[PDB]
Amino acid sequence: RPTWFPGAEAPAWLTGEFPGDRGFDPCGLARDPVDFAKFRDSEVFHGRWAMLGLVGCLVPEVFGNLGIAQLPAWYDAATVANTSNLDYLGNPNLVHASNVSFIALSTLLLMGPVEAWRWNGALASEAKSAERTTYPGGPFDPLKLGASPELKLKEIKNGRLAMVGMFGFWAQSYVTGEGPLANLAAHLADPAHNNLLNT
């Protein structure tokens, strides 16, 4: 079986039934098969939020460079909403939001139902069964294609990449003090002397 390290033997509980299995579980976190189904949902979920979060974090830089709008930087938006107004796509008549606590309240109030419904497996107040959803289909799959194990592996794989990417964005922004594409531009200019190990 393909594994994360040359020759490395898989655990007993990681067999290969589920997409993305490369026998990686040193810390033995999926011994309990009850916790493994939750973790599997959490992995895909974390993945999908990372992918959307990556795209949404590149969008200010791209829209800046292509002359679409002067959006704030991803690490500045909460500061902008806190001190001034957050105007959608530059346009001061769009959204124009000014108070960070009302944004947070709204975020809990909108995402609460949606999150409960996701967990419950339906638009109801009690879970249908003891199983996580993860691949709903129906309205969430308008193009009528999917849930094949190859596509699932494609989701898992891009997800994992985006989560490592997102960690990148956080650390980069702290260290370099500038935007992510700016960091790419810096490395592409002079790679021997615009990197981490050069000081």
Binding site: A8, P26, C27, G28, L29, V175, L196, L197, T199
Partner: protein, 217 residues
Amino acid sequence: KWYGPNRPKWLGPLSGGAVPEYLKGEYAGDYGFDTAGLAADPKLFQRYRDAELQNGRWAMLGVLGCLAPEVLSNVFGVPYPEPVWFKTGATILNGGSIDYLANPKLIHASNLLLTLVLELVFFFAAETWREAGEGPLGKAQDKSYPGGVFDPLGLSKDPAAFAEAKVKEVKNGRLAMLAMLGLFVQAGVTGQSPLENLSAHLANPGVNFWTSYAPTL
């Protein structure tokens, strides 16, 4: 190097009466040395065995970690603030930071107590798993010789090679323990780096000794 009743012993050929009875050559590094009788109780002997291996393995990483940043600063031009082992530590004091490989984008740690508290918490977990012999990383095969995740290359699979390598481990461990005790006493007496101590005795085999410091006591 071996086990059994006719293994190497600590007084060499003249080691007839020099071996206590309870040391029957079952465990690695038995040269029949126990002159204070500490291991006469066999539960105490299991304890001490684990302790000798814990001190040893820590001593090995220690001596490597006390020498490596000095060597990196000497050989290569890595600009450590105070690269000596007994002077490292104070770097995080005052307003200074700790930068891995003297690169201020690497750890950039300035909070001593946050460092220490994280260490104690991590160790309280990992040492409690060690003592229990079961934890996240699995159940131990032997308390001192866990195996599993701890042996990823499978070098303990062969029984005879494992039996030898236990003797290699305990002998390197003992040396490292004497090294570390060396480092401590050298710093306490000479006040200089241990690579400077070596350089001073390489330049001059003669007076540059412990018997240049002994007259001052």
